[model samples]
Target chain A: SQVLKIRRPDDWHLHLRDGDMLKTVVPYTSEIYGRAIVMPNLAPPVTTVEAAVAYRQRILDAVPAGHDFTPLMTCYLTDSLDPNELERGFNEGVFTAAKLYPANATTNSSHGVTSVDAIMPVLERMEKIGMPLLVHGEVTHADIDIFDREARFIESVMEPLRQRLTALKVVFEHITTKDAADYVRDGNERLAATITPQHLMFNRNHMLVGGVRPHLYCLPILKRNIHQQALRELVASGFNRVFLGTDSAPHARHRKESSCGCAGCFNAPTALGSYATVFEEMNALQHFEAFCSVNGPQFYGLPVNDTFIELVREEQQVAESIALTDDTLVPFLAGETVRWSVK
Target chain B: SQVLKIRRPDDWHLHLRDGDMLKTVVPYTSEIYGRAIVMPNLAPPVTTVEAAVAYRQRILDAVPAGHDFTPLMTCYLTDSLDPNELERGFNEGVFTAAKLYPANHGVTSVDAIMPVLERMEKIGMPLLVHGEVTHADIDIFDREARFIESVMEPLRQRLTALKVVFEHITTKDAADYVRDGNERLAATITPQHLMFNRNHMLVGGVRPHLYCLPILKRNIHQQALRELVASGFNRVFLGTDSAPHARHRKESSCGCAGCFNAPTALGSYATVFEEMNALQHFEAFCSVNGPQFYGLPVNDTFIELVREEQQVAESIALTDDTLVPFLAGETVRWSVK
Candidate 1:
């Protein structure tokens, strides 16, 4: 009986878009993730515990049939963020961390926080209260170009943020580029990264090469070959600040194929398989557990599930896409037979 | 009149902030530039015509008591952008271009449309986008690491957004980084940076030598110096983006230390006088293609320019804070002056 070995794995960065998509993708996530930090980007991008709490319930109700999974909530940081409120969430255990989506960042993020200076009060509070700040690092300026965003963001925002708040914990979520990997790898105690399968799998060229697979797209968009190698080297390096965050964003097939498809690459169903493949390819299978099971708990101040899940490489009929009530949903790597299957 | 005889340039990428700063800086620019594509990272991150239009008004009113500079405005790109509204603004001439601010970016940019990918087909408009990558890390991240992170901010959500011109390109890596990026991407060459290097910033070990939006980057960015020097990419063109920071604001505990660049901004064009040496290219970098990119008529006429031994300053005093001009206080070897 070679079912993939089971260990409760938590997704560091997962966007279960509100309403219908929430209901549609909850099951797929329940099947794989034991817990996930659902993204805070919704219309009026979730900025408070009230919104986080409400969003958390939708996630709870959306789960199919019955599942033991929990949705760890977070607060979205804004320029005018209230440090006291951030403390309330962290102290009360209502929110694990405060998510900083620099004002005009990724999906549903138009209402995000503007600048680090404006948010300094809240950052001081997060640091004082000992709460983590999950950041989507990129600086927006008419001067900067798009593809070079991640790098420019690091230069313009991340280092300054880190320097100013050395005590504050920060999570570099969904890092997709090589510069990201290296920066996080070399980051201080307060810094770490939630590396995603999408970033690990595809580089910028793959983005266009696949003939614009809108469904495969997500924010903190796919980067380049040099960056892909950076991720590979980072993963293979066995750095402690790096770990898995599926960033499993779900969009209905129609929503994805339309003129403006919703961003998010749904890869939760095959998350383990995808990582297993990444490990196998990189010859870092032995380091997989640290990334999957250990590093997350260490960074999140949570317990590493005592139980362990073992996955062996074999031909597995992993569902590439899920047939929702109306539209079908697809996983990141659908057709490929990976050498590893989780038991 | 030396003023009328003076060359009138355009700031391709300028952040006027809001009413107060916008007004204060407008005079310096009106005293120089004919127009500038003002940035769209407002507090709510100006996302709509109403906002951009309203912002333009505030800027117009803010123009120091009596200045007549035209601010070419832009829309802040957000995740939930209405392409129709964006198109309408551009079509109606209410907006010159759209801005792509990666979320949670710098001041006044929380509302930058993050879903810019979706706006491609409906809005094939030119964008004066904030190009520093916020996707993986922050702006400081670009400086410490040699890895080219220039386009790490390209919106992958749709794989198609049209005509992205990276604003305030300060690094040479930008030239190489832009080389392999999506065809839609281009670079907006700034004046302050044409001759200045990050090495100067490191020279003083602080912000005194450092100023501007995209800040500055490593020594390698000097290669971008060469790209513009060689003019390899036709897409690369001149735009002073000359921002002037008030003296007091620049020298505070949190003094916002941007160079009050407008005064000596044309020095940007002259720095080229030393680099390109070709008087013909200087006119193009300063005047011709910039208008072409914005679809405006190139200057009906060309003015004669030259470079020769002239003294300039490393810093200038308005009041409390001594502002560092781009080629400030140094004896510029060449100038249209």
Candidate 2:
């Protein structure tokens, strides 16, 4: 029995690529989310005030006919990004937040800042201006066990960053592990995390099951149901820091299924539907609104949207892959019918 | 809305190493599982049916002072095994079943059946096979996926064996794959698998999250969880496979942590049983049926259990590396409350 009759949600963390890809996926998100903190991991990693402002326009221009969805832009942090430039971007009222990707992490993050320390000037300015740090919480260490990096980064990087930049509002993006939940739940109110739909529903085995199905594979991969339960419990514990963010990084089929496939799951098309499975499985339907609709806005300081949406436990088909012109895109748990769907 | 009850469930597949390990962990499980399918993967690989029977006696001797648990022994199939001798042991009731390890699959299976298909024709023996088709090249390819095709399917088809248990199933896809194949093909599911998927191994950044062979699978494997519950695949059943890696062994430069699931397994099983809406089947899945499979009488007594709220262990230090349980940081909705 699904019982969450809730508000139209805003995804605190979302990836809406500009141009064709942006127009292609925006309607799927607009169907559920009113606005989203559009990620800044572009080809060169959107870092400047001008790039972010223009990027926001391109996203607006790309929004297909008649959709009122808002795309919040962020300044992508780099080692040499000027603090004055950041404040100008913030004061220009064009930028709502700034994204910090540790170099070489998910999607297009090569131009990312090398270390939290390297971005001190940029962070301090964001702190002074009350701008939040949307982080991709992983360290690209080949030797490191892929699962435990979330906790490691929080301690080695994020924790120290918070300690050094006291005023920096940090939104730990796409939290997938229990340790991340534990740390974010206990950390400062300035520290919050956006949990993804994939982490809630799938674990690493899901992607690795059918001969390394590329679509199911994403960066900061899905965690165990053990971690999934831990996340639900943290959000259900009334910990406001835990909010919904579908790190639903959509990739085209050829890019995903290739010999070296690009990661990033596309759940924006069925964001609520996927998460509804987790909430239903956890019996945490009561906490859905708080995590998805209420908390993100509260943490982001945006007025919560007023419209409502509903979901039920009826069966629905979740396609394995969707065609986008010449290429196809695979979603998480693609092609299976799930018990939960948006009503 | 936590409305489920628990019972002392049986762990059908268990590996109780000889000596201190047997003594130390036996109690944790003795208090829980009424009986277990004690693996024959010991150092000498419990080869003979007599050794199998004797090993059972040692495990029986090792069972804690007052606990009412039993360890059912199985014959370790070797290519040289005598068919008459094997039938005599099963008929004469020395060992209940036979174990087939596809030679060098893991640590102790070096002496496992050499040429498996040939041995199957001697007698229609029920084989509890370790299903890890470990890639020798060790370059990371999908070994579990390959195991199903290269080993399991061929073995099942050729052996024409009476029963085949794909032991310690690591992937839900593997389990679903087996379920799709044959009714006689049963799998001894583990709580670690039932609770954690492969990505789970990376939860806390290299905690040696109980490193077990045929390591955890990723999310898509868990998609079959509903099928495991709904199909009533008498073929699909519960077994803790509650292996424990000693704290030091689990936490060294090459630390290991899997095999410490004994204490928290029931709690984890409680989570799964309730989630599956199979609270009714918990009794059969955990106890009665396993005994029936082994042809042993069910335990005369029943332990009333409850699935209630509770906190679980995160880590416990023995020497250097602490052993971690499945849901280490959870407040379980289904516990023996």
Candidate 3:
């Protein structure tokens, strides 16, 4: 029997919405992984240390009984963010770092920081305190073409921010373009990125062609095939700083198939399988463990999980849609067969 | 009172699917258009003269009780096209033109249609082309531009006098080519292409309804297309490419590619012309250029459009299926009076 084993992984980026949604989605990641860096773009956002602490407990409360999982929380950066409050959260261990969502960049991101200038002091403090800054790396310029937003962000916002704040650990989150992959690959140790399985597995064609597959849609939206190829090659190229961050955001089926569908892929349930499939395709299964388990922790200065998870080479069809409360969320590789399994 | 009137226009390119759909959509066009060059890509396609005639009659029957609309029929070109049959349909006045589906491998390239193109040239039969490359290698936006370089340019050069209407042109390369080509070369500009760029389809969300073959192009290309029409080139005319797909089919995981704009096509065209401040050229694009290119008589009928705002219905029922029209759920500035 063909079998593969790796240290139980961590979802470097995740969104487990509060209340029923949190209860429903937490187990999908908790059952399979040791920890997940939960997103902070809630309706009210997890801006304060008090909110991050409360949200972290809500995620903990939702974790299935007997499942050993930890939720790493982050502060949502805003225009008027208090540097002292952010420093307090990080020092108190409520926040692993802070998240920068360019205003109106994606779902629940209207409360996102308008400009890096608004939170420059917060960023400077983060650099001094050694807390990583996770960015939803996309420009909110209306005229900038959507496909070009990530690359534009790198040019207009990210490069300038990095130049002004050297030694600031920045995890350019869910990069979707070749420009981004090449940027992170060539950047210094302080600059790294997390690649989502959806970006690895698909492109704009998958989302737009034939029919608009809203379930595959997400912010820093999927790019052309050339970009997808670049990302796949980067992951298989054994780049240490680049690691798995599912960015496994979820939206109910109806909400997703709306007039203007929400942006996200509910990929947590099938993230590992999806990542394994890509690794196997690239013949870089050896690099999979580091990307999924080690690199993320190393970048954040945490120890890798000691627990091991086995993935047997088996053919299984991913669920078309997973039920949550009264609604349904179509998962990644929904209704498609994946060869690797984390059973 | 801020009104614009022009000779009743012709839909240089259109799709009025047969049966119940034909009945449902014909009135929208017939009420305004003097005639429409109906598309030939049906389930079995209108390849035969008899089939074209029967389809034409079905469309004629579908025209509302008072509307006197002519359904100019077309021959669906195939790999094994019978030149004699095509010319026969043309001489008999049943076939106005034959369409080229370049992606249809059997009849894709200039080589496949060289024989028929020669025959059409000899007989003065126009060739209408859906100017897009079907190859998997060419990006969808680049297909129209690439098709012109690879297939259209060569075909035109080979049969210089053959009248060719580059159907539903959506690229700058195509606009430049047609603007530079001889009087025999013409292009149809669609309202959707003029109003929105690839951004409208791809921006905040992937709008499946805006997804069509020779997909909505980039901003530069959209600007060029708008400029081409605004230039009053005389060869650039209105073609809605007002294709209708069932709403369910359009909003699916892999929706059909179309924008059923027959309902508000003229209003949409007026909006474009008004924006360009080229209302003088509007009559020529919508009324004169199409008829002149096809070597048909200009219609004596006239229609007036008032400067009034009308919201486009999100969807319209065509018997069993509902169609989401172009600019669906959006407001247009012009309304047919």
Candidate 4:
């Protein structure tokens, strides 16, 4: 089976930053994915319904001609958000989900929610309307170890929140630990998780082994190999509760290679091929289609991509750096070869 | 006390890269300490007696005038190294110790280097180890702890008389192991490991300056190191591991491992001792323990540190590009007086 043809995939978690970055990165994702859950962590963030509508248009404008792509917008949850405004956006279909980022958790998250309890009115309204809540699951306490943030979030915030809001449909985004995999696997129908290519492919060793490879640095940073193994096992099991989310974040090469580099992989270009490599290695290509296409839309109550995308067993070398205006952006797996390619 | 005085210190584990890097970093350590165990992991490591003699002379020439310093050279062990050559260097005072880097071409397994080990044990020479397994299968953070179980303990048990300095100990497991071992076993703790954790290297950014081999561990491990030093564990002492690299080499896509901590190593160690309220035991850890372990006489000279804020330069001139000093652009509470 040199070629793999599956229902066209969607990126359940993605960041398409505004202006030049948005113009440069949108095409890479739009060309491959049928749709992407466009992250709301812009500089100001896509908070209001009007901002999301306008932001969606900007995304649509950036897509190269004839590449069909839908941008599923999300609301950036803040402490003072109004429940009525959230309901309006959900009903109008302008907000597919509301994202919860613990304040100062990652890039441009200074405006994020301070505490879940502070936004209870908004979350309860989201639960009542049957809207999915996408979460960047990490606690933002200065005392918590960076590697322990996600698991700490689960014990301190996630369990209590889920218990209180039983009917809330939640998608734990880019989970990187054994604790997260086990938690989501044992979760009820209202729960699901989005696994990223980097999480399945690389661990902390890849990022820290020879020298500190900032390109592999991301929030809820890559965990130990044992945790990476747990994530691989969970996805390989054809778990219906898990699906694909590239978290295809991009920063200019200088930004990443600086004194204090930003966190993100910018993996959209080789995301599908990386996933294919993982599935092939796991001998679980049988479950690749559902994990990539079927599970995500099922959780969101949307339609699976009708068309099929073909991938062939061919070596493809990722560009060392992609042009970004005057500067350049380094993609994940730069100068590295992937065994599979979209044909 | 506003000012603290201590017997001159020595670095048990240090890397003085040859040529331009050598000239640039020598003054920083030479100015403060009486001696340093110069590492041998050079381009072509200092493997032979001739190389050790020549390297030691180069280091001496680079030392600034009026600042007395001695570089206690070490032999870079290899699988094919002559145990006779090692014994000659040790007897002639050209080699103070022998270094074992597991990642390099030296003995990867204990049994492979039995002849070398047996000779060093017999001669009362100490073995300096970069104690981390290089296997890709092992986690980077867990490498040191794993190396202990896989190699260190077995080697110690096999050669009971062989003296070992577990250079640059970074974890609680290591502190506990060295503390519980016999008088022959000792360890050196670096300033960066005691002052900073993995958090300082990773939290707000990936600080390449703070990155070194057997990388910094968690805060809990940092606290354990503090506790060990505070307890005045006689076996443990100072080793800055003050490795330097060109600025461009360090702040790159794949930066090199090491921190140029030589510039402020003493003050940094002073800050840690003051914070731990164990300044009373500072001099012994810095000056006495290392020489005693190696059977060398402690230096008669003294160095004083004052309780004053010292601002570290963001970077220092090195060859073509600069080298970023550890604690760059930050202020340390103690300064050399």
Q: Which one is best on lDDT?
A: 4
Tell me how candidate 4 scores on lDDT. 0.90
| Native contacts matched by each model | 0.00, 0.05, 0.37, 0.69
Stretch of 10 with least lDDT, candidate 1 chain A: A204-213
Q: Is candidate 1 or candidate 4 better by lDDT?
A: 4
lDDT of 4 by residue, B76-156 (tens): 988888999999999999988999888536667767778998999999999998899889978999999999999999999
Candidate DockQ values, in order, are 0.02, 0.04, 0.50, 0.75
TM-score of each: 0.51, 0.54, 0.96, 0.98
| Model 3 regions lying over 4 Å from their true place | A103-110, B104-108
Return the top candidate by TM-score.
4
lDDT of 1 at A277: 79
- Best first by lDDT, ranked: 4, 3, 2, 1
Flag the better candidate by TM-score, 3 or 4: 4
Ranking by DockQ: 4, 3, 2, 1
- Model 4 clash tally? 0
Candidate 1, B223-283: lDDT as tens digits: 5555564554456666566555554444322234355566556655565644665544555
Evaluation by TM-score, superior candidate among 1 and 3: 3
Top-down TM-score ranking: 4, 3, 2, 1
CAPRI band of model 2? Answer: incorrect
What are the per-residue Cα lDDT tens digits for candidate 2 across A276-318?
7676667777777888788989888888889888877777788
Model 4 chain B: lowest-lDDT 10 consecutive positions: B103-112
Q: Please state the CAPRI-style docking class of candidate 1.
A: incorrect
